[PDB]
């Protein structure tokens, strides 16, 4: 046999952890992304890029550690270790935020590798590729949020920093500056995620409560055999129940499970489209008719205008520390504030 | 049979297109009342003085709102937790000004939704099923109770209940973050795990079953016609699905037992949502998310900011701007 | 007051979940179908169709 | 003119009609506010 | 309220064009042998 065929044999051996040709891309990249996150969160600072402490070594906890984005002055530089910024100096690279681009790039290629793994394994075992197809939603979210959005903004600095509290700050920044909650694409994403959770719960519970009695045990799990040919629960009884409770019910199992694929995947894709818009500040920020009315009529008020006031507060109070490169100095007298607070 | 016997047989009949049951006898009138009042109010109600400072907020379509901005506005802070039925007002004009529709709607809705859960149990009993679908439903219902009743009880006013509208919901969320730092609360983090994971596992399960469908149709026909309602045999190959997923991660990370699988699907999101409901219901009593403001200090004593401090700046913006005319004293104690 | 109120709301709610769980199961076990549906006497199969 | 053998009948069942109408009407309800602006 | 004038026709067509597409397909399915 040729060396290519021998290598294919070895890569596709049946072992505890499947490797595959996709493994050559997936495993080094996924390992480097995860290891970079752990290394940065344990030992690396954000002092020179954000003015922040961001590691266990500095005293942060699991909620506050992060691998923070590079400084805004770096633009969209790849920040390669051998690049002109760090110039091969590992310590300076870490201090300049090279770990953020390191993680983002090795992670993107790791996602590519994992999807290729889905395809490869499906082909080898003879199943259809719908798991790989569904994984396109996480990939679309990751690309839109961590690459396209910063690429449309001034620099990597405004991408999410890899951390719990940093992600929370990302949420609040999007509310304050983009009015992201008002965006119908985020709304469709929310519908997809919450509806997916609803479907997950309702289907699990319906199956578990329409099981057939296939054993004498009061714990019903042992009464299923993976090689059995018969359905383990009564579709007829479940359909009757939901028809009489909610008015409509599934009657086709194949449609049911495809719908479970369709809902969350579509929702995430819609959210990604919205974020592509926000990359250009192309927001659903205002309703022009309401703004005209409110400008002319000081007694007109809605929850929309109230939320706009909240956004103005967020921007004014968070910008000076969240965007240190701007050198904002907002005198106390200019800060928006309500009475007494 | 006597008249009462006949009526009981009809009420509990499993042959009605929609089951009624004894829980339904309460559910139907209350949900109808809540629905009718909500629709009428959303379309036509006049502005409501939510914060009790004689600054009415417009919620209805006819008074300048669209679908996204409209809402049934919570009852006035002047009312607090007082019961404000129509007959407690001097007139419908006063009732509307003070936001009575909100109380009518949410009370009838909460009662009707509780009865909806009970009705799920009751019909399962009539049909000879196992009983715990209602337990699954208790998670979203608990969330509704948390935002419509528990949080108002803890804070002392139905004016702090969630508004019945889209932008109103956003307002509720933002103020909640300003006053309780919900993002840094472990129960909301468990809720996010619950819903992200629920969506994830929904997609995973749907995709695995769809990938293991057994060939029963041609390429010109939808594969869904390969399943006939009520057929005895399973329509997909769970053994193949397990082979795939076990090789995707590793053998022992994949379910080979469909019953265990579906129990996990039920349990993950349901428990997550229970915990998030408890998060709202406990922040109702002002036990707030983690506060690490100025936790990191240097040798001299300089504050070294963290992402938590950045969050705090955003929260301060929200806090100082919300309900801009309602506070007279320095602390917002409820 | 905050500690006590939060703790006991959590406990009260989970005990409501317990009531529902054990009451439903008690009804099902007394009636004889807490282990599942009998295949040869599935109640719904003997009922008229809704439509 | 010999007929084309590649023709196939097309179908949309009633449940699909209901699902599609629901999708369309809900999308309209969602986006109408932004169309009116 | 000073709304976008074209919003009315935008919404009407957004609803009607896909809905009529679906109705055509459904009725011609029902009429098949």
């Amino acid at each position: 046999r040729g060396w290519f065929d021998i290598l294919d044999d070895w890569l596709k051996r049946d072992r505890f952890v499947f490797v595959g040709w996709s493994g050559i891309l997936l495993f080094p990249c996924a390992y480097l992304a995860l290891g970079g996150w752990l290394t940065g969160t344990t030992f690396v600072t954000s002092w020179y890029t954000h003015g922040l402490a961001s590691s266990y070594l500095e005293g942060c906890n699991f909620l506050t550690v992060a691998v923070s984005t590079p400084a805004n002055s770096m633009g969209h530089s790849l920040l390669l270790l051998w690049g002109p910024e760090a110039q091969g100096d590992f310590t300076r690279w870490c201090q300049l935020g090279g770990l953020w681009t390191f993680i983002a790039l090795h992670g993107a290629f790791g996602l590519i590798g994992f999807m290729l793994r889905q395809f490869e394994i499906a082909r080898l075992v003879g199943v259809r590729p719908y798991n790989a197809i569904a994984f396109s939603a996480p990939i679309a979210v990751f690309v839109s949020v961590f690459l396209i959005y910063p690429l449309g903004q001034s620099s990597w600095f405004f991408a999410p920093s890899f951390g719990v509290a940093a992600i929370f700050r990302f949420l609040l920044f999007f509310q304050g500056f983009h009015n992201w909650t008002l965006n119908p694409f985020h709304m469709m994403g929310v519908a997809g995620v919450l509806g997916g959770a609803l479907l997950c719960a309702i289907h699990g519970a319906t199956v578990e409560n329409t099981l057939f009695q296939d054993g004498e045990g009061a714990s019903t799990f042992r009464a299923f055999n993976p090689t059995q040919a018969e359905e383990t629960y009564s579709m007829v009884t479940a359909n009757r129940f939901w028809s009489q409770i909610f008015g409509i019910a599934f009657s086709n199992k194949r449609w049911l499970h495809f719908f479970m694929l369709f809902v969350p995947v579509t929702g995430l894709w819609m959210s990604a489209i919205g974020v592509v818009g926000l990359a250009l500040n192309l927001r659903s920020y205002d309703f022009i008719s309401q703004e005209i009315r409110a400008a002319e009529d000081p007694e007109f008020e809605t929850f929309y205008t109230k939320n706009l006031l909240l956004n103005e507060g967020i921007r004014a109070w968070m910008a000076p520390q969240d965007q240190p490169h701007e050198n904002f100095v907002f005198p106390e007298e200019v800060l928006p504030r309500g009475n007494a607070l | 049979a006597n008249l009462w016997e006949r009526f009981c047989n009809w009420v509990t009949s499993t042959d009605n297109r929609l089951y009624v049951g004894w829980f339904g006898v309460i559910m139907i009138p209350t949900l109808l009342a809540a629905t009718i009042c909500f629709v009428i109010a959303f379309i036509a109600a006049p502005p409501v003085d939510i914060d009790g400072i004689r600054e009415p907020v417009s919620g209805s379509l006819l008074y300048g709102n669209n679908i996204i901005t409209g809402a049934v506005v919570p009852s006035s802070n002047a009312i607090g937790l007082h019961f404000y039925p129509i007959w407690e007002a001097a007139s419908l004009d006063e009732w509307l000004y003070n936001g009575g529709p909100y109380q009518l709607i949410i009370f009838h809705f909460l009662l009707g939704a509780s009865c909806y859960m009970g009705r799920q149990w009751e019909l399962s009993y009539r049909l000879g099923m196992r009983p715990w679908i209602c337990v699954a439903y208790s998670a979203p219902l608990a969330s509704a109770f948390a935002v419509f009743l528990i949080y108002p009880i803890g804070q002392g006013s139905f004016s702090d209940g969630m508004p019945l509208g889209i932008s109103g919901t956003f307002n509720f969320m933002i103020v909640f973050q300003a006053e309780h730092n919900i993002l840094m609360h472990p129960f909301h983090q468990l809720g996010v795990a619950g819903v992200f994971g629920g969506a994830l596992f929904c997609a995973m399960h749907g995709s695995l079953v769809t990938s293991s469908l057994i060939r029963e149709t041609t390429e010109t026909e939808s594969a869904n016609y390969g399943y006939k309602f009520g057929q005895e045999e399973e329509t997909y190959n769970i053994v193949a699905a397990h082979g795939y997923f076990g090789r995707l991660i590793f053998q022992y990370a994949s379910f080979n037992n469909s019953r265990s699988l579906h129990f996990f699907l039920a349990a993950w999101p349901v428990v997550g949502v229970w915990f998030t409901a408890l998060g709202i219901s406990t922040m109702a009593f002002n036990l707030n998310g983690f506060n690490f403001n100025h936790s990191v200090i240097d040798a001299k004593g300089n504050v070294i900011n963290t992402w938590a401090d950045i969050i705090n700046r955003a929260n301060l913006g929200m806090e100082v701007m919300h309900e801009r005319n309602a506070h007279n004293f320095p602390l917002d104690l409820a | 007051r905050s500690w006590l109120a939060t703790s006991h709301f959590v406990l009260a709610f989970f005990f409501l979940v317990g009531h529902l769980w054990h009451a439903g199961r008690a009804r099902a076990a007394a009636a004889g179908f807490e282990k599942g549906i009998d295949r040869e006497s599935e109640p719904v199969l003997s009922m008229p169709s809704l439509d | 003119m010999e007929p084309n053998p590649n023709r196939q009948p097309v179908e949309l069942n009633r449940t699909s009609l209901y699902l599609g109408l629901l999708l369309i009407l809900v999308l309209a309800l969602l986006f109408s506010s932004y169309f009116f602006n | 309220m000073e709304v976008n004038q074209l919003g009315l026709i935008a919404t009407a067509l957004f609803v009607l064009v896909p809905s009529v597409f679906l109705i055509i397909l459904y009725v011609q399915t029902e009429s098949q042998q």
Partner: peptide
């Protein structure tokens, strides 16, 4: 016009509910 549009769409959705529940294609066992 905008209020009419919103309410019209809502009423159409409710009618759709009615037909989808009471005029569904009936499930039929094989």
């Amino acid at each position: 016009m905008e209020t009419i549009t919103y309410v019209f769409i809502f009423a159409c959705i409710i009618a759709l509910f009615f037909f989808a529940i009471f005029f569904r294609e009936p499930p039929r066992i094989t």
